[PDB]
A = this chain, B = another copy of it.
Amino acid sequence: DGVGNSSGNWHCDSTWMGDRVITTSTRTWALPTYNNHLYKQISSQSGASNDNHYFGYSTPWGYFDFNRFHCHFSPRDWQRLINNNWGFRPKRLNFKLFNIQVKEVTQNDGTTTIANNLTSTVQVFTDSEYQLPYVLGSAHQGCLPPFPADVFMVPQYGYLTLNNGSQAVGRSSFYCLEYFPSQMLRTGNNFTFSYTFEDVPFHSSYAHSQSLDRLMNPLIDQYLYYLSRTNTPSGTTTQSRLQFSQAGASDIRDQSRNWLPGPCYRQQRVSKTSADNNNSEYSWTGATKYHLNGRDSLVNPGPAMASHKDDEEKFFPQSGVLIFGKQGSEKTNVDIEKVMITDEEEIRTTNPVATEQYGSVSTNLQRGNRQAATADVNTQGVLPGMVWQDRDVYLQGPIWAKIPHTDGHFHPSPLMGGFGLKHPPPQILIKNTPVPANPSTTFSAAKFASFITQYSTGQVSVEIEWELQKENSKRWNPEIQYTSNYNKSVNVDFTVDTNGVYSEPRPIGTRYLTRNL
């Protein structure tokens, strides 16, 4: 209402009550004019490799992105969550846009001037029928910034469709976003909508205190037998004789078991110590990849697998983990001290190590003159009796992904981590309404190319309720907790420096508490 009344108030806090936590984040955003109000066909450059070809469209619209956990949880909030809860999941969200300001920019005479345009509008619509290509869930920049005092730029919306090389095909779709209905907002108007999450499984924010190969009573023998010797000493040599034993603690690898470890898709191993790696360019040639319509894509991060085995923390899968950048890290070819490499070590209780074989299978039929032969299994699809953990989530990491619209999707938990949703939180798209500049006094049928330079700013609030599954642990000894480091330092972790720059010093997962298998 009017011009002198704010359309909303600042809400940032977390409310912990019972099995629920509610997070609220308010930020200040700025929206420019994109593409000078045009839709543009875009494509890969002429010299691009086949694996890098694309075709699509850039739009004049922007969109809002709060699909990272930091956007909602403070570092102290994240600690409170991960130290006390076995699981959590999102329930509902609220979204608000308010305190909208449109401003005119006159760059005349090399001097910039900025004035309020109290009459201009912004257009906002939710894609609640999921009729546009969903580009959230691709881990793009442009989120609400983790620190509440920071002002962020709204990212530009674009999408890809079917390409053959740099060219489109008959099935390529083009979308005009102005062909949707949208709200027009003038200074003093606000925008709200609500969303309910579908029923989704809790994220498992625990590690297992048991391993899948150690589930039996070590004090008692099995009543089942296994083949323990295939020959026996006969005089001066051996002869073929099959012999059988019941497995106890002494031969614990040989016990009959009910379950199998999860599936595998083997990754190459790289060392954080530089001298242990081969002196060669293998970042692509040695990469784990999939092949789709004659194209190779890197499998990154791929299926959830343990980063390393015991005492090998310096090793990680080539493209098998999420890697976050440190504050101020650049885009291209940075050193390893500039990035933060997550560790999925916790899931090695049930999941194969990413850089090892799944196991060994028999390849032949032995006999008197043929010895038994085995082969390493480097790729293992799911088997009946397999169990596994999903990838962990991080404070820096994504929250949800849209499950692709397909006939079949096995265990549709997104591989970068988080909650797979058939109807995710809808895309919220926004743009400044074009305001034409001074027209000619003689009619012209050509479209207007001359506009008044404008941008918008405002406040955005996002409120998410999360359902908690509290830890109820009967173990006697104390557990592992996330804690801040104990010593003195120049800067405090998760703080601003003397220049006002907020930084996140390390990745924080969720799995600190333990449970039995």
Give residues in A with beta carbon < 8 Å to B.
1-6, 8-13, 24, 26, 28, 30-43, 57, 60, 74, 99, 101, 103-106, 108-109, 111-114, 116-121, 123, 125, 141-142, 145, 147-153, 155-156, 164-165, 167-170, 172, 174, 176, 178-189, 433-441, 443-445, 447-448, 451-453, 455, 457, 459, 484-492, 494-500, 502
Contact = CB atoms under 8 A, between A and B. Distances in A.
A189 B452 CA distance: 22
A12 B180 contact: yes
A153 B448 contact: yes
Nearest to A150: B447
Contacts of A181: 9-13, 24
Contacts of A33: 441
Contacts of A149: 37-39, 60, 176, 178
Given A448-B30, A497-B41, A121 B6 contact: yes
B4 A189 contact: yes
B2 A495 contact: no
Nearest to A151: B448
A252 B183 CA distance: 65
Contact of A178 (B114, B148, B176, B182): B148
Contacts of A491: 41, 168
* Copies of this protein, total: 2
A207 B397 CA distance: 59
Given A1-B4, A13-B180, A30-B436, 8 more contacts: A2-B3, A4-B189, A6-B186, A13-B179, A24-B181, A30-B448, A32-B440, A42-B498
A39 B500 contact: yes
B434 A151 contact: yes
Nearest to A172: B492
23 contacts: A3-B4, A6-B186, A6-B189, A9-B182, A9-B183, A9-B184, A10-B125, A10-B182, A10-B184, A12-B179, A32-B439, A40-B497, A41-B495, A41-B496, A99-B433, A103-B438, A114-B438, A116-B118, A168-B489, A168-B490, A169-B489, A435-B457, A439-B455
Contact of A10 (B26, B35, B123): B123
